[PDB]
Amino acid sequence: PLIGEIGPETYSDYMSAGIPLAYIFAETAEERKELSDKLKPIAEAQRGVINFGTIDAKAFGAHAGNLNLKTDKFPAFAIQEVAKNQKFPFDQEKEITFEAIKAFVDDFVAGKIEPSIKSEPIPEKQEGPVTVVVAKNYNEIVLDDTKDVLIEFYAPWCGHCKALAPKYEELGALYAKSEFKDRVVIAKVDATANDVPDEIQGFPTIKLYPAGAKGQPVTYSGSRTVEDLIKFIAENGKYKAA
């Protein structure tokens, strides 16, 4: 059929087809059938341009994360550009109608949709001395030209990251009670759960984005002690802060 079933057996063939895959996520076979029937004419119009399939959002709801979709909100629709490793999620707050999916797919084909940037949600509160960065607040926080921003790119599974974390919190606390508390940010970002503009080759990576020098961040290479990190901030930031 034109709209097949995306699952562990058919995934490799969709990934080998060399064209995007549009996913129709729904939690029941009836809804999958309803949406497949509804959207068939769009799949037909796109034959050989974009493959369409349904995907069992009960069994494979987690797969929605691969498309920068929320893993808990169905039904859902997204296009994966397999060539380019780009993901184009349709807004899970909108109803999946013929007209809206047609307009979405038409916009995708027209080049009108920017690839989605993977991000955790904006943290609901920013209290505790270390600031949590996600892709959606990276520009506002890290590239804030009025603050020296120390940013740790880490993975939750990373042993050195785990070892660093208590020292990193001690560092945040020192700055938070310093006379530089409104111009130094001690921040971290889970680089496994957020796309960042930085090229990160290993974890942890620590960079200082100085006030007034955001295009020239300084990569830290010291001993990862609190004292060494204070020195690093003091030496490389605009505010010579400690």
Partner: peptide
Amino acid sequence: GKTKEGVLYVG
């Protein structure tokens, strides 16, 4: 393939 969490993968 699928992971235990239900993520699909190739190969």
